[PDB]
Amino acid sequence: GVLYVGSKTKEGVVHGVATVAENTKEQVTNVGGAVVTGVTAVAQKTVEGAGSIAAATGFVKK
Amino acid sequence: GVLYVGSKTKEGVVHGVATVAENTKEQVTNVGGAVVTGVTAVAQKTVEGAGSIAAATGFVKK
Numbered sequence: 001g002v003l004y005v006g007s008k009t010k011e012g013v014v015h016g017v018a019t020v021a022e023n024t025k026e027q028v029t030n031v032g033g034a035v036v037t038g039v040t041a042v043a044q045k046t047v048e049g050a051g052s053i054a055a056a057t058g059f060v061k062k
Numbered sequence: 063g064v065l066y067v068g069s070k071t072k073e074g075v076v077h078g079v080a081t082v083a084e085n086t087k088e089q090v091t092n093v094g095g096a097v098v099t100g101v102t103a104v105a106q107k108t109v110e111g112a113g114s115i116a117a118a119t120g121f122v123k124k
Contacts, residue, residue: 007040
């Protein structure tokens with residue numbers, strides 16, 4: 001299928017995932033997987049297959 | 063006289079005079095004279111003398 005997408009922007013500043021942490025014991029920032037953060041962010045047919053994306057963190061501290 | 067001034071800033075972005083103009087016939091931006099636009103902007107005894115600062119524009123179009 002056609003996905004024509006016309007974005008004419010005068011001016012644009014786009015910020016993706018932001019990680020800010022102050023006065024933290026132990027810090028683990030988890031950013032990854034499938035993230036698209038452009039001015040014209042277009043994503044299609046992501047993992048149309050069997051597999052899938054997974055962004056997971058392994059902090060336990062038992 | 064004493065003018066102790068203690069400014070401890072975590073983070074600061076300061077913008078001076080801003081000139082934005084779109085679709086203008088004839089443009090004359092006049093920024094000058096005595097302008098101080100720092101993070102810690104301190105001005106004292108400006109033209110304590112006879113003279114004075116003057117920021118003037120000479121547009122007539124008669």
